[PDB]
Symmetry: D2
Subunit: 116 residues, 4 copies
Protein backbone atom coordinates (compact mmCIF):
# COMPACT_ATOMS: atom_id res chain seq x y z
CA UNK A 1 0.00 0.00 0.00
CA UNK A 2 1.33 3.45 -1.12
CA UNK A 3 -0.65 5.43 1.48
CA UNK A 4 -0.31 4.79 5.22
CA UNK A 5 -1.56 6.91 8.15
CA UNK A 6 -0.09 6.74 11.68
CA UNK A 7 -1.65 8.59 14.62
CA UNK A 8 -0.05 9.13 18.04
CA UNK A 9 -1.48 10.50 21.28
CA UNK A 10 0.95 13.07 22.82
CA UNK A 11 -0.87 13.07 26.18
CA UNK A 12 -0.60 9.34 26.93
CA UNK A 13 2.49 8.66 24.83
CA UNK A 14 0.87 5.89 22.87
CA UNK A 15 -0.65 5.03 19.49
CA UNK A 16 -4.07 6.61 18.94
CA UNK A 17 -6.28 3.57 18.41
CA UNK A 18 -9.60 3.39 16.56
CA UNK A 19 -9.26 6.85 15.01
CA UNK A 20 -11.47 7.30 11.93
CA UNK A 21 -9.66 8.50 8.81
CA UNK A 22 -11.33 9.60 5.57
CA UNK A 23 -9.47 10.26 2.31
CA UNK A 24 -10.82 12.31 -0.59
CA UNK A 25 -9.49 13.21 -4.02
CA UNK A 26 -10.22 16.47 -5.81
CA UNK A 27 -12.34 15.76 -8.87
CA UNK A 28 -12.15 17.47 -12.26
CA UNK A 29 -15.16 19.54 -11.15
CA UNK A 30 -13.13 20.75 -8.14
CA UNK A 31 -15.14 18.96 -5.45
CA UNK A 32 -13.84 16.45 -2.89
CA UNK A 33 -14.79 12.93 -3.88
CA UNK A 34 -14.63 10.02 -1.39
CA UNK A 35 -11.50 7.93 -2.05
CA UNK A 36 -10.95 5.63 0.94
CA UNK A 37 -11.44 5.36 4.70
CA UNK A 38 -10.64 3.20 7.70
CA UNK A 39 -9.69 3.21 11.38
CA UNK A 40 -6.29 3.06 13.06
CA UNK A 41 -5.20 -0.28 14.57
CA UNK A 42 -3.82 -1.05 18.04
CA UNK A 43 -0.49 0.23 16.67
CA UNK A 44 -2.08 3.55 15.67
CA UNK A 45 -1.61 2.62 12.02
CA UNK A 46 -3.93 2.44 9.01
CA UNK A 47 -2.77 0.39 6.02
CA UNK A 48 -4.58 -0.90 2.95
CA UNK A 49 -6.40 2.33 2.13
CA UNK A 50 -5.46 2.04 -1.56
CA UNK A 51 -3.26 0.44 -4.25
CA UNK A 52 -0.59 1.74 -6.63
CA UNK A 53 -3.09 1.32 -9.47
CA UNK A 54 -5.91 3.26 -7.80
CA UNK A 55 -3.73 5.96 -6.22
CA UNK A 56 -3.33 8.11 -9.31
CA UNK A 57 -1.85 11.58 -9.61
CA UNK A 58 -4.12 14.15 -7.97
CA UNK A 59 -4.79 16.41 -4.99
CA UNK A 60 -5.76 14.41 -1.91
CA UNK A 61 -7.20 15.19 1.49
CA UNK A 62 -6.81 13.02 4.57
CA UNK A 63 -9.19 14.00 7.37
CA UNK A 64 -8.44 12.44 10.73
CA UNK A 65 -11.33 12.52 13.20
CA UNK A 66 -9.42 13.81 16.21
CA UNK A 67 -12.52 15.26 17.87
CA UNK A 68 -14.24 11.89 18.38
CA UNK A 69 -10.94 10.48 19.64
CA UNK A 70 -10.56 13.09 22.40
CA UNK A 71 -14.29 13.20 23.26
CA UNK A 72 -14.19 9.42 23.80
CA UNK A 73 -11.39 10.07 26.33
CA UNK A 74 -13.43 12.68 28.20
CA UNK A 75 -11.69 15.66 26.60
CA UNK A 76 -13.30 18.50 24.59
CA UNK A 77 -10.57 19.36 22.03
CA UNK A 78 -10.06 22.51 19.96
CA UNK A 79 -9.97 21.06 16.44
CA UNK A 80 -12.87 19.39 14.63
CA UNK A 81 -10.32 17.15 12.92
CA UNK A 82 -6.83 17.22 11.42
CA UNK A 83 -6.83 17.55 7.62
CA UNK A 84 -3.77 16.99 5.43
CA UNK A 85 -4.10 18.26 1.84
CA UNK A 86 -1.41 17.42 -0.73
CA UNK A 87 -0.63 16.67 -4.36
CA UNK A 88 0.42 13.05 -4.84
CA UNK A 89 2.33 11.09 -7.49
CA UNK A 90 2.93 14.07 -9.77
CA UNK A 91 6.49 12.89 -10.50
CA UNK A 92 5.54 9.22 -10.59
CA UNK A 93 4.37 6.80 -7.84
CA UNK A 94 5.65 7.37 -4.30
CA UNK A 95 4.96 5.82 -0.90
CA UNK A 96 3.40 8.23 1.60
CA UNK A 97 3.28 7.89 5.36
CA UNK A 98 1.09 10.61 6.87
CA UNK A 99 1.84 10.88 10.60
CA UNK A 100 -0.30 12.89 13.01
CA UNK A 101 0.85 13.75 16.58
CA UNK A 102 -2.22 14.74 18.66
CA UNK A 103 -2.78 16.96 21.69
CA UNK A 104 -6.15 18.43 22.79
CA UNK A 105 -5.28 21.96 21.59
CA UNK A 106 -2.52 21.20 19.10
CA UNK A 107 -1.47 18.76 16.44
CA UNK A 108 1.45 18.15 14.16
CA UNK A 109 1.40 16.30 10.86
CA UNK A 110 4.38 15.12 8.89
CA UNK A 111 4.76 13.33 5.58
CA UNK A 112 7.56 10.81 5.06
CA UNK A 113 7.77 10.14 1.33
CA UNK A 114 9.92 7.38 -0.13
CA UNK A 115 10.26 5.63 -3.48
CA UNK A 116 8.24 2.42 -4.08
CA UNK B 1 -10.05 41.44 17.61
CA UNK B 2 -10.91 38.00 19.13
CA UNK B 3 -9.06 36.05 16.44
CA UNK B 4 -5.40 36.29 15.51
CA UNK B 5 -3.01 34.13 13.49
CA UNK B 6 0.74 33.83 13.98
CA UNK B 7 2.96 31.86 11.62
CA UNK B 8 6.60 30.82 12.07
CA UNK B 9 9.20 29.38 9.73
CA UNK B 10 11.06 26.42 11.29
CA UNK B 11 13.69 26.35 8.51
CA UNK B 12 14.86 29.97 8.87
CA UNK B 13 13.92 30.37 12.54
CA UNK B 14 11.87 33.50 12.03
CA UNK B 15 8.34 34.76 11.60
CA UNK B 16 6.76 33.64 8.31
CA UNK B 17 6.15 36.95 6.56
CA UNK B 18 3.51 37.71 3.94
CA UNK B 19 1.75 34.34 4.22
CA UNK B 20 -1.81 34.45 2.86
CA UNK B 21 -4.46 33.48 5.41
CA UNK B 22 -8.14 32.94 4.62
CA UNK B 23 -10.85 32.42 7.22
CA UNK B 24 -14.13 30.72 6.35
CA UNK B 25 -17.32 30.17 8.34
CA UNK B 26 -19.50 27.11 7.78
CA UNK B 27 -22.95 28.02 6.47
CA UNK B 28 -26.30 26.22 6.79
CA UNK B 29 -25.60 24.60 3.42
CA UNK B 30 -22.52 23.05 5.09
CA UNK B 31 -20.37 25.00 2.62
CA UNK B 32 -17.46 27.27 3.48
CA UNK B 33 -18.16 30.97 3.05
CA UNK B 34 -15.35 33.57 3.03
CA UNK B 35 -15.25 35.36 6.39
CA UNK B 36 -11.95 37.30 6.64
CA UNK B 37 -8.42 37.21 5.21
CA UNK B 38 -5.08 39.00 5.08
CA UNK B 39 -1.32 38.46 5.00
CA UNK B 40 1.03 38.00 7.94
CA UNK B 41 3.10 41.05 8.88
CA UNK B 42 6.87 41.31 9.40
CA UNK B 43 6.26 39.76 12.83
CA UNK B 44 4.43 36.83 11.20
CA UNK B 45 1.15 37.96 12.77
CA UNK B 46 -2.28 38.70 11.40
CA UNK B 47 -4.71 40.63 13.60
CA UNK B 48 -7.90 42.58 12.93
CA UNK B 49 -9.51 39.66 11.08
CA UNK B 50 -12.83 40.13 12.86
CA UNK B 51 -14.60 41.79 15.79
CA UNK B 52 -16.40 40.39 18.83
CA UNK B 53 -19.75 41.37 17.32
CA UNK B 54 -19.10 39.43 14.11
CA UNK B 55 -17.28 36.47 15.65
CA UNK B 56 -20.30 34.49 16.81
CA UNK B 57 -20.34 30.79 17.70
CA UNK B 58 -20.08 28.38 14.80
CA UNK B 59 -17.57 26.30 12.86
CA UNK B 60 -14.62 28.15 11.32
CA UNK B 61 -11.76 27.15 9.03
CA UNK B 62 -8.44 28.99 8.88
CA UNK B 63 -6.50 28.16 5.73
CA UNK B 64 -2.83 29.17 5.64
CA UNK B 65 -1.20 29.19 2.20
CA UNK B 66 1.98 27.36 3.12
CA UNK B 67 2.62 26.14 -0.43
CA UNK B 68 3.03 29.67 -1.87
CA UNK B 69 5.29 30.56 1.06
CA UNK B 70 7.76 27.70 0.47
CA UNK B 71 7.55 28.19 -3.29
CA UNK B 72 8.65 31.80 -2.85
CA UNK B 73 11.66 30.54 -0.87
CA UNK B 74 12.57 27.95 -3.50
CA UNK B 75 11.91 24.99 -1.22
CA UNK B 76 9.69 22.12 -2.41
CA UNK B 77 6.73 21.73 -0.01
CA UNK B 78 4.44 18.82 0.70
CA UNK B 79 1.14 20.41 1.73
CA UNK B 80 -1.16 22.51 -0.40
CA UNK B 81 -1.93 24.49 2.75
CA UNK B 82 -2.58 24.23 6.47
CA UNK B 83 -6.27 24.16 7.47
CA UNK B 84 -7.30 24.66 11.09
CA UNK B 85 -11.00 23.77 11.61
CA UNK B 86 -12.63 24.52 14.97
CA UNK B 87 -15.85 25.46 16.75
CA UNK B 88 -15.89 28.87 18.44
CA UNK B 89 -17.73 28.74 21.78
CA UNK B 90 -18.76 31.65 24.02
CA UNK B 91 -18.70 29.49 27.13
CA UNK B 92 -14.91 29.46 26.95
CA UNK B 93 -12.05 32.00 26.77
CA UNK B 94 -12.76 35.02 24.55
CA UNK B 95 -9.51 35.38 22.57
CA UNK B 96 -8.18 32.84 20.05
CA UNK B 97 -4.59 32.76 18.80
CA UNK B 98 -3.97 30.18 16.07
CA UNK B 99 -0.22 29.56 15.86
CA UNK B 100 1.26 27.55 12.98
CA UNK B 101 4.85 26.30 12.95
CA UNK B 102 5.97 25.51 9.41
CA UNK B 103 8.45 23.08 7.86
CA UNK B 104 8.37 22.00 4.17
CA UNK B 105 7.05 18.49 4.98
CA UNK B 106 5.60 19.09 8.42
CA UNK B 107 3.55 21.62 10.35
CA UNK B 108 1.98 21.99 13.75
CA UNK B 109 -0.92 24.18 14.68
CA UNK B 110 -1.86 25.19 18.21
CA UNK B 111 -4.74 27.18 19.66
CA UNK B 112 -3.96 29.47 22.62
CA UNK B 113 -7.34 30.59 23.95
CA UNK B 114 -7.32 33.21 26.71
CA UNK B 115 -9.49 35.82 28.42
CA UNK B 116 -9.33 39.56 27.87
CA UNK C 1 16.87 41.73 26.72
CA UNK C 2 18.26 39.63 23.80
CA UNK C 3 16.91 36.34 25.17
CA UNK C 4 13.32 35.45 25.94
CA UNK C 5 11.45 32.21 26.60
CA UNK C 6 7.79 31.51 25.86
CA UNK C 7 6.07 28.30 26.91
CA UNK C 8 2.66 26.96 25.86
CA UNK C 9 0.46 24.16 27.13
CA UNK C 10 -0.90 21.99 24.28
CA UNK C 11 -3.35 20.16 26.57
CA UNK C 12 -5.16 23.24 27.91
CA UNK C 13 -4.47 25.48 24.90
CA UNK C 14 -3.00 28.31 26.92
CA UNK C 15 0.26 29.84 28.05
CA UNK C 16 2.16 27.60 30.50
CA UNK C 17 2.25 29.75 33.61
CA UNK C 18 4.83 29.65 36.41
CA UNK C 19 7.14 27.18 34.65
CA UNK C 20 10.69 27.28 36.06
CA UNK C 21 13.35 28.12 33.48
CA UNK C 22 17.10 27.94 34.09
CA UNK C 23 19.74 29.19 31.67
CA UNK C 24 23.31 27.90 31.79
CA UNK C 25 26.45 28.93 29.92
CA UNK C 26 29.16 26.41 29.07
CA UNK C 27 32.45 27.20 30.81
CA UNK C 28 36.05 26.40 29.84
CA UNK C 29 35.80 23.28 32.02
CA UNK C 30 32.98 22.19 29.67
CA UNK C 31 30.63 22.32 32.67
CA UNK C 32 27.33 24.17 32.84
CA UNK C 33 27.37 27.29 34.99
CA UNK C 34 24.15 29.02 36.11
CA UNK C 35 23.57 32.13 33.99
CA UNK C 36 19.98 33.33 34.52
CA UNK C 37 16.58 31.95 35.58
CA UNK C 38 12.98 32.84 36.39
CA UNK C 39 9.39 31.67 36.04
CA UNK C 40 7.03 32.22 33.13
CA UNK C 41 4.40 34.93 33.63
CA UNK C 42 0.63 34.73 33.13
CA UNK C 43 1.35 35.10 29.41
CA UNK C 44 3.75 32.14 29.55
CA UNK C 45 6.70 34.44 28.84
CA UNK C 46 10.00 35.05 30.56
CA UNK C 47 11.94 38.19 29.63
CA UNK C 48 14.77 40.13 31.28
CA UNK C 49 16.95 37.03 31.61
CA UNK C 50 20.05 38.86 30.42
CA UNK C 51 21.36 41.99 28.69
CA UNK C 52 23.24 42.53 25.44
CA UNK C 53 26.43 43.27 27.38
CA UNK C 54 26.28 39.97 29.27
CA UNK C 55 24.95 37.80 26.44
CA UNK C 56 28.23 37.18 24.62
CA UNK C 57 28.88 34.41 22.10
CA UNK C 58 29.19 30.91 23.51
CA UNK C 59 27.18 27.76 24.13
CA UNK C 60 24.02 28.10 26.22
CA UNK C 61 21.50 25.64 27.64
CA UNK C 62 17.91 26.58 28.49
CA UNK C 63 16.29 24.03 30.79
CA UNK C 64 12.51 24.20 31.17
CA UNK C 65 11.06 22.31 34.15
CA UNK C 66 8.22 20.59 32.33
CA UNK C 67 7.96 17.76 34.86
CA UNK C 68 7.00 20.05 37.77
CA UNK C 69 4.48 21.80 35.50
CA UNK C 70 2.60 18.61 34.56
CA UNK C 71 2.89 17.30 38.12
CA UNK C 72 1.14 20.43 39.38
CA UNK C 73 -1.68 19.73 36.90
CA UNK C 74 -2.00 16.10 37.97
CA UNK C 75 -0.92 14.73 34.59
CA UNK C 76 1.82 12.09 34.39
CA UNK C 77 4.70 13.41 32.23
CA UNK C 78 7.44 11.63 30.34
CA UNK C 79 10.35 14.08 30.32
CA UNK C 80 12.33 15.31 33.30
CA UNK C 81 12.59 18.64 31.48
CA UNK C 82 13.11 20.28 28.11
CA UNK C 83 16.71 21.36 27.36
CA UNK C 84 17.47 23.67 24.46
CA UNK C 85 21.24 23.81 23.75
CA UNK C 86 22.55 26.33 21.21
CA UNK C 87 25.47 28.56 20.23
CA UNK C 88 24.82 32.30 20.34
CA UNK C 89 26.50 34.09 17.42
CA UNK C 90 26.89 37.84 16.86
CA UNK C 91 27.08 37.42 13.10
CA UNK C 92 23.37 36.63 13.07
CA UNK C 93 20.11 38.23 14.30
CA UNK C 94 20.36 39.93 17.71
CA UNK C 95 17.20 38.73 19.48
CA UNK C 96 16.46 35.11 20.44
CA UNK C 97 13.00 33.80 21.34
CA UNK C 98 12.98 30.18 22.51
CA UNK C 99 9.41 28.88 22.23
CA UNK C 100 8.45 25.52 23.75
CA UNK C 101 5.15 23.78 23.04
CA UNK C 102 4.35 21.23 25.73
CA UNK C 103 2.42 17.97 25.85
CA UNK C 104 2.85 15.31 28.60
CA UNK C 105 4.74 12.89 26.29
CA UNK C 106 5.91 15.29 23.61
CA UNK C 107 7.38 18.75 23.19
CA UNK C 108 8.70 20.95 20.44
CA UNK C 109 11.12 23.80 20.78
CA UNK C 110 11.70 26.50 18.18
CA UNK C 111 14.11 29.42 17.97
CA UNK C 112 12.80 32.64 16.40
CA UNK C 113 15.86 34.85 15.91
CA UNK C 114 15.25 38.41 14.71
CA UNK C 115 16.84 41.85 14.52
CA UNK C 116 16.03 44.80 16.76
CA UNK D 1 15.21 -4.16 22.31
CA UNK D 2 13.33 -1.94 24.86
CA UNK D 3 14.80 1.34 23.58
CA UNK D 4 14.42 2.48 19.97
CA UNK D 5 15.13 5.91 18.44
CA UNK D 6 13.56 7.17 15.18
CA UNK D 7 14.63 10.42 13.53
CA UNK D 8 12.80 12.21 10.70
CA UNK D 9 13.82 15.18 8.55
CA UNK D 10 10.90 17.69 8.29
CA UNK D 11 12.54 19.59 5.41
CA UNK D 12 12.91 16.68 2.98
CA UNK D 13 10.09 14.55 4.38
CA UNK D 14 12.26 11.52 4.88
CA UNK D 15 14.06 9.46 7.52
CA UNK D 16 17.17 11.18 8.91
CA UNK D 17 19.90 8.70 8.04
CA UNK D 18 23.28 8.27 9.74
CA UNK D 19 22.40 10.47 12.71
CA UNK D 20 24.63 9.80 15.74
CA UNK D 21 22.78 9.05 18.97
CA UNK D 22 24.37 8.78 22.42
CA UNK D 23 22.57 7.48 25.52
CA UNK D 24 23.66 8.14 29.10
CA UNK D 25 22.35 7.06 32.48
CA UNK D 26 22.56 9.17 35.63
CA UNK D 27 24.91 7.49 38.09
CA UNK D 28 24.57 7.34 41.87
CA UNK D 29 27.11 10.20 42.00
CA UNK D 30 24.76 12.29 39.83
CA UNK D 31 26.93 12.37 36.71
CA UNK D 32 25.99 11.17 33.21
CA UNK D 33 27.61 7.83 32.47
CA UNK D 34 27.85 6.46 28.90
CA UNK D 35 25.18 3.79 28.36
CA UNK D 36 24.92 3.10 24.61
CA UNK D 37 25.27 4.73 21.20
CA UNK D 38 24.74 4.13 17.50
CA UNK D 39 23.64 5.69 14.22
CA UNK D 40 20.25 5.75 12.52
CA UNK D 41 19.71 3.38 9.56
CA UNK D 42 18.33 4.09 6.08
CA UNK D 43 14.89 3.96 7.74
CA UNK D 44 15.91 6.64 10.25
CA UNK D 45 15.78 4.04 13.02
CA UNK D 46 18.23 2.88 15.69
CA UNK D 47 17.58 -0.50 17.31
CA UNK D 48 19.73 -2.74 19.48
CA UNK D 49 20.98 -0.01 21.81
CA UNK D 50 20.27 -2.16 24.89
CA UNK D 51 18.53 -5.19 26.40
CA UNK D 52 15.77 -5.67 28.99
CA UNK D 53 18.43 -6.92 31.42
CA UNK D 54 20.79 -3.96 30.98
CA UNK D 55 18.08 -1.27 30.75
CA UNK D 56 17.45 -0.93 34.48
CA UNK D 57 15.38 1.65 36.30
CA UNK D 58 17.08 5.06 36.17
CA UNK D 59 17.20 8.53 34.63
CA UNK D 60 18.37 8.42 31.03
CA UNK D 61 19.49 10.96 28.46
CA UNK D 62 19.36 10.45 24.71
CA UNK D 63 21.40 13.04 22.81
CA UNK D 64 20.78 13.14 19.08
CA UNK D 65 23.50 14.89 17.07
CA UNK D 66 21.26 17.08 14.94
CA UNK D 67 23.98 19.67 14.29
CA UNK D 68 26.24 17.30 12.34
CA UNK D 69 23.20 16.08 10.41
CA UNK D 70 22.23 19.57 9.19
CA UNK D 71 25.83 20.73 8.65
CA UNK D 72 26.39 17.71 6.40
CA UNK D 73 23.41 18.95 4.35
CA UNK D 74 24.86 22.46 4.02
CA UNK D 75 22.68 23.97 6.75
CA UNK D 76 23.86 25.76 9.93
CA UNK D 77 21.13 24.82 12.47
CA UNK D 78 20.16 26.48 15.75
CA UNK D 79 20.49 23.55 18.17
CA UNK D 80 23.72 21.78 19.11
CA UNK D 81 21.69 18.58 19.45
CA UNK D 82 18.32 17.31 20.64
CA UNK D 83 18.43 15.80 24.14
CA UNK D 84 15.62 13.74 25.67
CA UNK D 85 15.88 13.22 29.46
CA UNK D 86 13.51 10.80 31.20
CA UNK D 87 13.03 8.31 34.01
CA UNK D 88 12.67 4.76 32.69
CA UNK D 89 11.27 1.48 34.02
CA UNK D 90 10.24 2.88 37.40
CA UNK D 91 6.99 0.88 37.32
CA UNK D 92 8.59 -2.16 35.72
CA UNK D 93 10.04 -2.75 32.21
CA UNK D 94 8.53 -0.83 29.31
CA UNK D 95 9.33 -0.44 25.61
CA UNK D 96 10.32 3.09 24.61
CA UNK D 97 10.32 4.58 21.14
CA UNK D 98 11.92 8.04 21.19
CA UNK D 99 10.97 9.89 17.99
CA UNK D 100 12.60 13.15 16.91
CA UNK D 101 11.16 15.36 14.12
CA UNK D 102 13.91 17.75 12.89
CA UNK D 103 13.92 21.19 11.29
CA UNK D 104 16.92 23.58 11.16
CA UNK D 105 15.49 25.91 13.84
CA UNK D 106 13.03 23.59 15.55
CA UNK D 107 12.55 20.04 16.70
CA UNK D 108 9.89 17.92 18.29
CA UNK D 109 10.42 14.78 20.34
CA UNK D 110 7.79 12.29 21.38
CA UNK D 111 7.88 9.13 23.44
CA UNK D 112 5.61 6.20 22.58
CA UNK D 113 5.69 3.83 25.55
CA UNK D 114 4.14 0.38 25.44
CA UNK D 115 4.27 -2.77 27.55
CA UNK D 116 6.86 -5.47 26.67
O1 LIG E 1 4.29 32.37 19.84
C1 LIG E 1 4.42 31.08 19.52
C2 LIG E 1 5.59 30.64 18.86
BR1 LIG E 1 6.96 31.88 18.47
C3 LIG E 1 5.73 29.28 18.51
BR2 LIG E 1 7.31 28.68 17.64
C4 LIG E 1 4.68 28.36 18.83
BR3 LIG E 1 4.86 26.53 18.37
C5 LIG E 1 3.49 28.81 19.50
BR4 LIG E 1 2.09 27.61 19.91
C6 LIG E 1 3.37 30.18 19.84
BR5 LIG E 1 1.82 30.83 20.70
O1 LIG F 1 6.72 7.10 13.47
C1 LIG F 1 6.60 8.39 13.79
C2 LIG F 1 6.35 8.76 15.11
BR1 LIG F 1 6.20 7.40 16.43
C3 LIG F 1 6.22 10.12 15.47
BR2 LIG F 1 5.90 10.60 17.28
C4 LIG F 1 6.34 11.12 14.48
BR3 LIG F 1 6.16 12.95 14.94
C5 LIG F 1 6.58 10.74 13.15
BR4 LIG F 1 6.72 12.06 11.80
C6 LIG F 1 6.72 9.37 12.81
BR5 LIG F 1 7.04 8.84 11.03
Amino acid sequence: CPLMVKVLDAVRGSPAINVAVHVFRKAADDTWEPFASGKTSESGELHGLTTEEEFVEGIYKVEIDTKSYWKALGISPFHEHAEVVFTANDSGPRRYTIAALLSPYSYSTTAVVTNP
